[PDB]
Amino acid sequence: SGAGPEMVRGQVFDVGPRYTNLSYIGEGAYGMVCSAYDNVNKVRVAIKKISPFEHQTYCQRTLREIKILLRFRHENIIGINDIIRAPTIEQMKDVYIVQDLMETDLYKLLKTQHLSNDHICYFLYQILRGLKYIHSANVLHRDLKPSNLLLNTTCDLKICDFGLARVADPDHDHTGFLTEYVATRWYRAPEIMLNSKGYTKSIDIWSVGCILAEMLSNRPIFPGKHYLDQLNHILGILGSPSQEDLNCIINLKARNYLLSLPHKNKVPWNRLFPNADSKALDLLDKMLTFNPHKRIEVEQALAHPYLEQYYDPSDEPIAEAPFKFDMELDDLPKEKLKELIFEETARFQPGY
Ligand SMILES: CC[C@H](C)Cc1nnc2cc(-c3ccnc(Nc4ccnn4C)n3)ccn12
């Protein structure tokens, strides 16, 4: 057994001596997740190494995920057990977020399993149960997809990866102030392309719609081959937008773009999903609604007939202290965000 830090696929995981036996789970552009063993609590954990400090955007995404998840406690949202980083800011090159280990994710499960309607129904209920809490906190997740839905054999489901999440205080108009090119391509609402700085939390409902379609068929519904291809896939099934929906698009340049497209008819849902529950296809239609204002909201989605076996507002917590603009003060130099990340994580340090 080496004395130095363990290393997974070339990435040092300086998490010893409490956390050992690291195993690769997955990775992103500036981070890697491994499973590990907590020798102090005698439990299996997942550890998310983030290395963001060279770029302001990565620092913003690290700070947000930490601040939001530390302030969240909900059965359908992954919690933070512990955060590891260096004792001084000059030494801190990485941050390690420790979470309870989940057995798999929905992306992996769908590679090997055709889900029963009951499993689809229960997974969908739980996604929306957690989303209800998220939206009640004035948070947008902005990256819901199968690989961010964690699953246990008991069918417990937890949403993870809040790196793309952010607060939008509804006392302020965020139109024109939101980041473009959010979400993962196949799961992007049309307005992320057509209203790239002025979308709302209804993009999360669009993503959930895409996830439901994927549970129904084990394949992505809108597998765009590149950024501009994505809208074409969406319209290829929804059909060309109605004049009404078109005339709701405030960005003239985007409206003219849509007028310039050849007309596509709508593909009926039961043609794509001929074996699906009719109730499930109705909720899918409401979630994959082109117009973001007519698109169903999370509470109405929970109240939909498809989910009536589970819908229970008395057992569906919401945020007791919804987030406000103080959680949005991060348009700052990456050197200053590094200080804020150091301060948010000090509560896990010896001393403090
Ligand atoms: C580098 C960031 C990455 C791309 C996205 C991301 N961000 N936060 C998380 C948290 C987990 C996680 C947590 C707990 N348990 C498992 N378990 C699991 C999932 C699949 N297999 N296994 C064993 N994962 C996973 C991914 N995550």
| Token reading at 291 | 């117009």
Find the CATH number of the domain harbouring 224: 1.10.510.10
Q: Taking the mean position of all CA atoms in its chain, how far away is CA 58?
A: 16
- Interior/surface letters 106-137, b for 16+ CB within 10 angstroms, e for the rest: bbebbeeeebeeeebbbbbbbbbbbbbbbbbb
Within 10 angstroms of residue 156's Cβ, the number of other Cβ atoms is 14
d(C-alpha 141, C-alpha 162), whole Å: 6
H runs (alpha helix) in 12-169: 56-70, 106-112, 117-136
Question: Of 38, 143, 204, 330, which residue is the catalytic one?
Answer: 143
CB 122 within 8 A of CB 162: no
Buried b (16+ CB within 10 A) or exposed e, 281-311: bebbebbbbbbbeebbebbebbebebbeebb
β-pairing verdict for 95-100 and 149-151? unpaired
C-alpha span between 138 and 23 (Å, rounded): 35
**Measured at the alpha carbon of residue 199, what is the angle toward residues 194 and 204, in degrees to the nearest 5?**
110
Full domain range(s) for residue 238 = 104-307
Whether 78 is in the pocket of ligand 1, judged by its Cβ within 6 Å, is yes
Structural Rg of the chain based on CA atoms: 21
Compute the C-alpha angle 80/81/87, nearest 5°. 95
* Secondary structure (3-state) at 100: strand
Residues 6+ apart with CB under 8 A from 314: none
Pairing mode, strands 31-38 and 19-28: antiparallel
- Which residues fall in the annotated binding site for ATP? 25-33, 48
CA distance linking residue 270 with residue 266, whole number of Å: 12
Residue 174 is encoded by which pair of tokens?
Answer: 């965020």
Q: E strand or H helix at 12, and its extent?
A: strand 11-13
Which atom of ligand 1 approaches the CA of 35 most closely?
A: 23
Exposure pattern of 74-99 as b/e (b: 16+ CB <10 Å)?
bebbbebbbbbbeeeeeeeebbbbbb
Q: Which residues contact 243 (CB under 8 A, 6 or more apart)?
A: none
**Phi, psi at residue 286, to the nearest 5°?**
-70, -30
Q: What is the resolution of this structure in A?
A: 2.1
Tokens coding 336:
């200053």
Q: Is the CB of 102 under 6 A from ligand 1?
A: yes
Active-site residue flag, 143 = yes
Phi, psi of 101 (to 5 degrees): -75, 130
